[PDB]
């Protein structure tokens with residue numbers, strides 16, 4: 431029952447500061463504009479120790495599978511080649527991506543009936559809110 435409250439299908443309902451987050455990460459103009467328009471469905475599932483997160487939108491469909499605490503290589507939707515580790519820290523799923531001497535963190539937490547996503551790159555934070563589909 432690792433991650434029970436995260437599991438399911440979720441739909442984006444609000445975003446704040448996401449263009450600025452993407453700028454800080456280094457995403458180019460055209461990608462920012464099309465990615466910032468996306469309204470993804472996030473599908474989280476667990477099978478034994480393996481967690482899978484799928485993000486599906488008109489911009490890109492991505493899928494990552496991982497074991498908590500065990501690093502993996504990831505090609506992001508904006509085409510960064512990153513080394514990622516996802517841990518559970520006090521009930522928060524913490525996803526760190528490292529590439530080119532940089533780092534960014536994406537935190538997912540359950541808050542009321544929502545799944546709140548916080549994206550941080552240096553001093554720039556963005557909040558995304560998901561509801562059950």
Ligand SMILES: CC(C)[C@@H]1CC[C@@H](C)C[C@H]1OC(=O)[C@H]1C[C@@H]1C(=O)O
Pocket residue numbers: 442452455457465466468470485489490506507508536547549558
């Ligand atoms: C549109 C998506 C695929 C963007 C693409 C640019 C990249 C820098 C960040 C990436 O966001 C994400 O992975 C997840 C935080 C977004 C969320 O949960 O909604």
